[PDB]
CSV table of N, CA and C in Angstrom, one decimal:
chain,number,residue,atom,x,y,z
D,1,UNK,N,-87.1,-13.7,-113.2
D,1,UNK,CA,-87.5,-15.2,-113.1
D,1,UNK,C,-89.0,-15.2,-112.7
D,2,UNK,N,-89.5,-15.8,-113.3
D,2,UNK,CA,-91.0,-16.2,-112.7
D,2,UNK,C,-91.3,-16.8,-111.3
D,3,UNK,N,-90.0,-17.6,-110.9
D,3,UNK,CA,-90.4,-18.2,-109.5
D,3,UNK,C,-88.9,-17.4,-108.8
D,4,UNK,N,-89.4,-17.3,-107.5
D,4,UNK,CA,-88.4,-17.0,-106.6
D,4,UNK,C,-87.4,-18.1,-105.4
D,5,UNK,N,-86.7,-18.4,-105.3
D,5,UNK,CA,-86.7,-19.5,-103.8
D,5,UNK,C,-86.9,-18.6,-102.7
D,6,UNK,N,-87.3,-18.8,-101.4
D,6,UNK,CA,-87.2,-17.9,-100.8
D,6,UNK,C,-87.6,-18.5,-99.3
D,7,UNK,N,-87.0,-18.0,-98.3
D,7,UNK,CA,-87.4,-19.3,-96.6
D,7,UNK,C,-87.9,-18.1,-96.2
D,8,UNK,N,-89.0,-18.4,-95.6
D,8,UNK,CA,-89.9,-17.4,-95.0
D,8,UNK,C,-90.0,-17.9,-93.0
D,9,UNK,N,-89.4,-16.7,-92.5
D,9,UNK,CA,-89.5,-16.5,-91.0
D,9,UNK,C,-90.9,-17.0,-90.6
D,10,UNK,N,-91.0,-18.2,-89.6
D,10,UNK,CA,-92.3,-18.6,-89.3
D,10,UNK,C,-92.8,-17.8,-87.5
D,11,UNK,N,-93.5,-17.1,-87.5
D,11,UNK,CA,-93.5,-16.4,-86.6
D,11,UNK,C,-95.0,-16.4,-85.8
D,12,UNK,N,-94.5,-16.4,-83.9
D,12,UNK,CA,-96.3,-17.4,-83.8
D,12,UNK,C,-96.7,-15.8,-83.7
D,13,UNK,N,-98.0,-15.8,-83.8
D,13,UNK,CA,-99.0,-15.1,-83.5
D,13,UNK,C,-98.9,-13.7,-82.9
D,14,UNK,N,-98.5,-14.3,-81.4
D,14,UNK,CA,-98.7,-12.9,-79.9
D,14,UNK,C,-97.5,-12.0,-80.6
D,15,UNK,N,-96.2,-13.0,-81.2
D,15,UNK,CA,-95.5,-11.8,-81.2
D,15,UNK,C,-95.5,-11.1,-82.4
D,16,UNK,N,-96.3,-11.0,-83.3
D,16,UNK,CA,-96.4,-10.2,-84.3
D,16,UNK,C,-96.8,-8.7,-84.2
D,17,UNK,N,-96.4,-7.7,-84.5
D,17,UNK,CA,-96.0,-6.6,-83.9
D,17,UNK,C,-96.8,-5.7,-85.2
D,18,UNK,N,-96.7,-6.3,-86.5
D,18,UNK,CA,-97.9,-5.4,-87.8
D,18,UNK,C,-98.4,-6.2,-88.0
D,19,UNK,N,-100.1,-6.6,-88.4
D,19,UNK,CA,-100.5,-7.6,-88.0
D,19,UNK,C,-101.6,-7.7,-89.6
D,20,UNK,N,-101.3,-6.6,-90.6
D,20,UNK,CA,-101.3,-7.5,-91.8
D,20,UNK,C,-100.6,-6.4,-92.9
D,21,UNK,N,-101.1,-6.0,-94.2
D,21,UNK,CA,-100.4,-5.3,-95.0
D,21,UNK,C,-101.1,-4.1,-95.8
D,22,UNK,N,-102.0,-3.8,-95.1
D,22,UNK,CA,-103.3,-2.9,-95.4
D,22,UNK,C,-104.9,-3.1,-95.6
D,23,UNK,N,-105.2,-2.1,-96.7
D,23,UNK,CA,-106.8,-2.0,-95.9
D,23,UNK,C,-107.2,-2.6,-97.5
D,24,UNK,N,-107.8,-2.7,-98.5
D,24,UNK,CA,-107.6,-3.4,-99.8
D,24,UNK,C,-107.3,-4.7,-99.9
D,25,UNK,N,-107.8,-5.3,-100.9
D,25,UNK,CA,-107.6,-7.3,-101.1
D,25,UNK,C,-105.8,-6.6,-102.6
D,26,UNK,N,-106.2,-5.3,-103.5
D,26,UNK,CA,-105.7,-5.4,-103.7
D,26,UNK,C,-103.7,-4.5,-103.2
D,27,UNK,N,-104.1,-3.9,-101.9
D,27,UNK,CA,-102.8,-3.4,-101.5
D,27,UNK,C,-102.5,-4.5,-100.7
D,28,UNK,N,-103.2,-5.2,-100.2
D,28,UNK,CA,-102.4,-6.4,-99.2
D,28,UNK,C,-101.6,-7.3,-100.1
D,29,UNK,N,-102.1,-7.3,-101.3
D,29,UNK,CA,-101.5,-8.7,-102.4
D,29,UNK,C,-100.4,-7.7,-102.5
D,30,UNK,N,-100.5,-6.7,-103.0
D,30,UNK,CA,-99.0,-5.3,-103.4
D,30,UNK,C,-98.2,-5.4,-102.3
D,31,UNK,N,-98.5,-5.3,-101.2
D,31,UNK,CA,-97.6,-5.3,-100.4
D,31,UNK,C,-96.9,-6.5,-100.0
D,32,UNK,N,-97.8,-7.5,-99.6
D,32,UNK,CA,-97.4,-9.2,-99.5
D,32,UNK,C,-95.9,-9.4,-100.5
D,33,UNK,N,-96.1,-9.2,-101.6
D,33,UNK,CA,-95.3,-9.5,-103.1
D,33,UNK,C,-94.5,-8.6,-103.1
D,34,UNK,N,-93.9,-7.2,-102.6
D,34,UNK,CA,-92.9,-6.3,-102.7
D,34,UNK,C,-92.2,-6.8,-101.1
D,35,UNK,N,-92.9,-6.9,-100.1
D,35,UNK,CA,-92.3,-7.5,-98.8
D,35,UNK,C,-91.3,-8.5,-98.8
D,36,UNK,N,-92.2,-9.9,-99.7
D,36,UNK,CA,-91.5,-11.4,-100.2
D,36,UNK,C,-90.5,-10.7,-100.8
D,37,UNK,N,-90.1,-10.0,-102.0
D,37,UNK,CA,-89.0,-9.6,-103.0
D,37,UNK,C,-88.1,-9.2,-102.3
D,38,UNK,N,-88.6,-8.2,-100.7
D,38,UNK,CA,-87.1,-7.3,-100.0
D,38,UNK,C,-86.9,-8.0,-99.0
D,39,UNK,N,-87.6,-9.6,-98.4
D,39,UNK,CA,-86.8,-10.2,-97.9
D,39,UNK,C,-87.6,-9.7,-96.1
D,40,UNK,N,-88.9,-9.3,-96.3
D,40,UNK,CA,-89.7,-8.8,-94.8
D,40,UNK,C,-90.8,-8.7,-95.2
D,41,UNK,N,-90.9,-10.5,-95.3
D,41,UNK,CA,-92.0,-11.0,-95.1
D,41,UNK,C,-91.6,-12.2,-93.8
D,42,UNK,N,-93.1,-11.9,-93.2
D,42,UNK,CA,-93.3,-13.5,-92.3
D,42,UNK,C,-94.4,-14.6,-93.0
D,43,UNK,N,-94.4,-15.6,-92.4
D,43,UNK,CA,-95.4,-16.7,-91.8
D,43,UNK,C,-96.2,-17.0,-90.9
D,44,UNK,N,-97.2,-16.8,-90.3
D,44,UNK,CA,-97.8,-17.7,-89.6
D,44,UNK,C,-98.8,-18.8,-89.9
D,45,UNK,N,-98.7,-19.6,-89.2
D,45,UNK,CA,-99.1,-21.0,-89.8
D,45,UNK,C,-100.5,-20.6,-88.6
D,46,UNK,N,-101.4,-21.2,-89.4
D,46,UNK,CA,-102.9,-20.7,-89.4
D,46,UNK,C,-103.5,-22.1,-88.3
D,47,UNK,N,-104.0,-22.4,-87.0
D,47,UNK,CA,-104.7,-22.9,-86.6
D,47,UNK,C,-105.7,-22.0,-85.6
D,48,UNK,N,-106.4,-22.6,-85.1
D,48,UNK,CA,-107.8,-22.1,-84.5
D,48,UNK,C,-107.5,-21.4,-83.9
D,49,UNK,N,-108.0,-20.0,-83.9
D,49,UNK,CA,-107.7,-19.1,-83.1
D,49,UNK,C,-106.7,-17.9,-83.5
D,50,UNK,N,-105.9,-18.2,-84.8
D,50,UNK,CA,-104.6,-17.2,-85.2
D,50,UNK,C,-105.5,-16.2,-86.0
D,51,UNK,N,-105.9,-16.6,-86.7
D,51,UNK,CA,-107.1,-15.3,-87.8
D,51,UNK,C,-107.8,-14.4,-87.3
D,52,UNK,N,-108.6,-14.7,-86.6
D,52,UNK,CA,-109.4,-13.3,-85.3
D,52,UNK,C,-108.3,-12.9,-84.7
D,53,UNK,N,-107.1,-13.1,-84.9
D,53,UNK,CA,-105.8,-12.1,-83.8
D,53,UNK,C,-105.1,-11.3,-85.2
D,54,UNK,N,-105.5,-11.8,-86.6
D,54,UNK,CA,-104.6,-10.9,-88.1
D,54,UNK,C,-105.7,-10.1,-88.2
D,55,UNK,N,-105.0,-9.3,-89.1
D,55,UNK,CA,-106.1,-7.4,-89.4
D,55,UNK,C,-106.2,-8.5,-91.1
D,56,UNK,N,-107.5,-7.9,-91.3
D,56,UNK,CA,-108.2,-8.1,-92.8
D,56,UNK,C,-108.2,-7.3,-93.8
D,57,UNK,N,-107.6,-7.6,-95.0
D,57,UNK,CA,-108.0,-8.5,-95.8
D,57,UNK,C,-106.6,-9.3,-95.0
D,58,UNK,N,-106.2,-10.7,-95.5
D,58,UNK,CA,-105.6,-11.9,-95.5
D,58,UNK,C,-104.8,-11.8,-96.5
D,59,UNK,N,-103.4,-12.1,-96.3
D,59,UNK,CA,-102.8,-13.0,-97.5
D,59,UNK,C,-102.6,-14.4,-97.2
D,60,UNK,N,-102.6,-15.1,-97.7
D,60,UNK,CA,-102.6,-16.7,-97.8
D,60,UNK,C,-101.1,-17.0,-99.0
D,61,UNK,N,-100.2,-17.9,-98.2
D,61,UNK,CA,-99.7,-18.4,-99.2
D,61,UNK,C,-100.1,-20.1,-99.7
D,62,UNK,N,-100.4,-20.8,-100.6
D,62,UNK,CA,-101.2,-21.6,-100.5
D,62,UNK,C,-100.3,-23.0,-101.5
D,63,UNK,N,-100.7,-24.0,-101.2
D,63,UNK,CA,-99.5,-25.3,-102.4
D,63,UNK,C,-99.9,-24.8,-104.0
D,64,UNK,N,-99.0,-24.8,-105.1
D,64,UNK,CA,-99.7,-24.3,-106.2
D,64,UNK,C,-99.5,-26.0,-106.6
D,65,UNK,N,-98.7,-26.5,-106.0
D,65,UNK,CA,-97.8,-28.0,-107.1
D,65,UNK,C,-98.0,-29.1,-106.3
D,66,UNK,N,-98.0,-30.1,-106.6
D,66,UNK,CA,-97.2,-31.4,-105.5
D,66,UNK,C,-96.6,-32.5,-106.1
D,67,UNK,N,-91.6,-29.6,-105.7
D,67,UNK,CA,-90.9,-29.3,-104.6
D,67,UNK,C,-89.5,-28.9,-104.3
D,68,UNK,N,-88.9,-28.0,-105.7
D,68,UNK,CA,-87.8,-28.1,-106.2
D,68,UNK,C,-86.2,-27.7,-105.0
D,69,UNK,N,-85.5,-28.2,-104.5
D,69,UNK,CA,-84.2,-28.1,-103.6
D,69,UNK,C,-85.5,-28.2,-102.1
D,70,UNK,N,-86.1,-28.7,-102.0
D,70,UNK,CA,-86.9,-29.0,-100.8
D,70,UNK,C,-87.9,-27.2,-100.7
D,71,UNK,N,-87.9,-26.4,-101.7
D,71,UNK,CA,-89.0,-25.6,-101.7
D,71,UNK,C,-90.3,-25.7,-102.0
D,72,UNK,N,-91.3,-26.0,-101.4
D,72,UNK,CA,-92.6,-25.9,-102.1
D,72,UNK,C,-93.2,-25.0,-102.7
D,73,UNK,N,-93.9,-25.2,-104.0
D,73,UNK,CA,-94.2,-24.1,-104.7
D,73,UNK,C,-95.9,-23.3,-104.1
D,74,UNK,N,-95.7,-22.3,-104.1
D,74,UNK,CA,-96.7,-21.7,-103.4
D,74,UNK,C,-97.0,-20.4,-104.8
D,75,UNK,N,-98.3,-20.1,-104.2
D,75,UNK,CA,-98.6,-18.6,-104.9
D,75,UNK,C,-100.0,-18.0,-103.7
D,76,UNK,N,-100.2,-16.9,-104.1
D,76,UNK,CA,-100.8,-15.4,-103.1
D,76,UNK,C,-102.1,-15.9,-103.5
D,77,UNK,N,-103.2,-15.9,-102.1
D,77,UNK,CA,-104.9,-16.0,-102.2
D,77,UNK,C,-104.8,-14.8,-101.0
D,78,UNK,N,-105.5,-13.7,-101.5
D,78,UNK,CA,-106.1,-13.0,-100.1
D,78,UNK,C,-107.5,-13.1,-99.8
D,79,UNK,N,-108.4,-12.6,-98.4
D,79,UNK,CA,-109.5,-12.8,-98.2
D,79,UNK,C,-109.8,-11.9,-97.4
D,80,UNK,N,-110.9,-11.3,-98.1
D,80,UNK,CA,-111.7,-10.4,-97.4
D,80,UNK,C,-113.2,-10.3,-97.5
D,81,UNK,N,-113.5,-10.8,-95.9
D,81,UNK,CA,-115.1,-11.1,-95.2
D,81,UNK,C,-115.6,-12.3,-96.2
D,82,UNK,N,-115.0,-13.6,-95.9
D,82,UNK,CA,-115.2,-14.4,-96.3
D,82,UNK,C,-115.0,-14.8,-97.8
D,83,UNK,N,-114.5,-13.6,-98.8
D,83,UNK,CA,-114.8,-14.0,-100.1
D,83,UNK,C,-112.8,-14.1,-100.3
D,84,UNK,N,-112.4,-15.0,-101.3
D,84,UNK,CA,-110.9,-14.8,-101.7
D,84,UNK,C,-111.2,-15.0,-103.2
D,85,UNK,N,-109.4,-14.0,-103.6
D,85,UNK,CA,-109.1,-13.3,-104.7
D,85,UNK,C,-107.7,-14.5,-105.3
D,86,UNK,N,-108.4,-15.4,-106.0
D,86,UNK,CA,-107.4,-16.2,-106.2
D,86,UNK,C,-107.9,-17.8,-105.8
D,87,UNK,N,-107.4,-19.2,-106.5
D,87,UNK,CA,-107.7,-20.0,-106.5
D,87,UNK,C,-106.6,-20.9,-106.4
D,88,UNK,N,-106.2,-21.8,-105.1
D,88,UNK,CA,-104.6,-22.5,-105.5
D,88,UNK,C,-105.0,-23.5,-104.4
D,89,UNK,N,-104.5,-24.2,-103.9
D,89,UNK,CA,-104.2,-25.3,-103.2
D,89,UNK,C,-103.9,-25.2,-101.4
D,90,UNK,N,-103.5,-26.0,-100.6
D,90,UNK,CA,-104.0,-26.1,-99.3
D,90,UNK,C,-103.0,-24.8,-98.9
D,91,UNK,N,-103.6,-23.9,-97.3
D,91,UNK,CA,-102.4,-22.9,-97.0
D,91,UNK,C,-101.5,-23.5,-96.4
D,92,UNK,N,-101.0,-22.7,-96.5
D,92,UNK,CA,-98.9,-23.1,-95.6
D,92,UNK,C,-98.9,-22.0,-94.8
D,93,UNK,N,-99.8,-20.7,-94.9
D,93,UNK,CA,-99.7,-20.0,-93.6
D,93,UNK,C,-100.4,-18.4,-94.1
D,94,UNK,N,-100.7,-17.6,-93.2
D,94,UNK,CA,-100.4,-16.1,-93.3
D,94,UNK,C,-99.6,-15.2,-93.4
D,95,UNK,N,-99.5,-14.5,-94.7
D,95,UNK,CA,-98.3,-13.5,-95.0
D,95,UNK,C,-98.2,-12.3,-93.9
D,96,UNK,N,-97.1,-12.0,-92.7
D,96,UNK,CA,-97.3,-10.7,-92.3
D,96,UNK,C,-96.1,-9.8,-92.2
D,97,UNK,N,-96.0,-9.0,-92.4
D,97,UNK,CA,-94.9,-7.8,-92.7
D,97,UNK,C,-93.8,-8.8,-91.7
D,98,UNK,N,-92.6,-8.5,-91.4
D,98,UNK,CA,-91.5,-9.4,-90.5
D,98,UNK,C,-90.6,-8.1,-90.3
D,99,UNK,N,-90.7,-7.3,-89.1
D,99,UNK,CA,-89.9,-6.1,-88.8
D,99,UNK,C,-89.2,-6.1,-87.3
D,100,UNK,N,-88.4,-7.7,-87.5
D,100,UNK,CA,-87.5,-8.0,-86.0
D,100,UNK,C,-87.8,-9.2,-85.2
D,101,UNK,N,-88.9,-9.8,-85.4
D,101,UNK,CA,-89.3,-10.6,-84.5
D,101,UNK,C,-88.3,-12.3,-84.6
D,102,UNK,N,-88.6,-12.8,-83.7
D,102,UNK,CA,-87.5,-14.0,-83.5
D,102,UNK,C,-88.5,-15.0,-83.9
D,103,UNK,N,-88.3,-15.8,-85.1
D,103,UNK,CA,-88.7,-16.9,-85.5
D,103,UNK,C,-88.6,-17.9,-84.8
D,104,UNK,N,-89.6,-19.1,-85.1
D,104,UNK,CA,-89.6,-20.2,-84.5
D,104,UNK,C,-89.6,-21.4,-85.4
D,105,UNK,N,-88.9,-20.9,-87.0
D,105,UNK,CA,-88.8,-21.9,-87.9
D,105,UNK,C,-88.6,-20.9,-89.3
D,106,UNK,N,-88.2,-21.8,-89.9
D,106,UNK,CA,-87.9,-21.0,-91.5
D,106,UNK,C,-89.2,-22.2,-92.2
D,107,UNK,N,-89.8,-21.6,-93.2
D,107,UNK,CA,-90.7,-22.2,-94.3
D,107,UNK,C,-90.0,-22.1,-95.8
D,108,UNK,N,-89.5,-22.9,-96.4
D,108,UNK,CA,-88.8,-23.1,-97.8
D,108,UNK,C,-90.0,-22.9,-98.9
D,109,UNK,N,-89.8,-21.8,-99.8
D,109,UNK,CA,-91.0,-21.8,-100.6
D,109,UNK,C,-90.4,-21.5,-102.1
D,110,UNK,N,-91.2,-21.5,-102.8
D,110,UNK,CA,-91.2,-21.4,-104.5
D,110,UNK,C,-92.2,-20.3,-105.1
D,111,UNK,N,-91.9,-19.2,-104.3
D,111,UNK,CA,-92.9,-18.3,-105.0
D,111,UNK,C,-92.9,-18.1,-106.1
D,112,UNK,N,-94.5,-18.1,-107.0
D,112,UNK,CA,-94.7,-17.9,-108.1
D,112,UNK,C,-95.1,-16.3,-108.4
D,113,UNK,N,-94.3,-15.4,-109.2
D,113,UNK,CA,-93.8,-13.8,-109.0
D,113,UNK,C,-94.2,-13.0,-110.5
């Protein structure tokens, strides 16, 4: 399928334990997108102060559309030292590996794969 459904673990910040997906704009997008497929991926939802606490490059999941069974369609921008790889719509959060941590919300999305 070209889109996935998929609820993504929204997880704050302090307790994030791997804090991105490698050193490359293009192994973090590799990794982000094989994570999402096995089901260990997170969220964090990005306000002042969350980004200086994630390792660089960034994944960004971002609106592609504006919502099918209440999933929003989303697709991958990463960013590294201010430049990003990819062009889409407002973020919904930061991709980061999810290896145990206790969520504080589920995020309903429509990846585009």
């Amino acid at each position: 399928k070209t889109h996935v459904q998929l609820s993504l673990p929204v997880l704050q910040v302090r307790d994030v334990l791997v804090r991105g997906f490698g050193d490359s704009v293009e192994e973090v997008l590799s990794e982000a997108r094989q994570h999402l497929k096995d089901g260990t991926c997170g969220l964090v939802e990005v306000e002042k102060g969350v980004l200086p606490q994630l390792e660089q490059p960034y994944v960004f999941i971002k609106r592609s559309d504006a919502a099918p069974h209440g999933h929003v369609m989303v697709e991958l921008v990463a960013e590294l030292e201010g430049i990003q790889y990819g062009r889409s719509g407002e973020t919904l959060g930061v991709l980061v590996p999810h290896v145990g941590e206790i969520p504080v919300a589920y995020r309903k999305v429509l990846l585009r794969k």
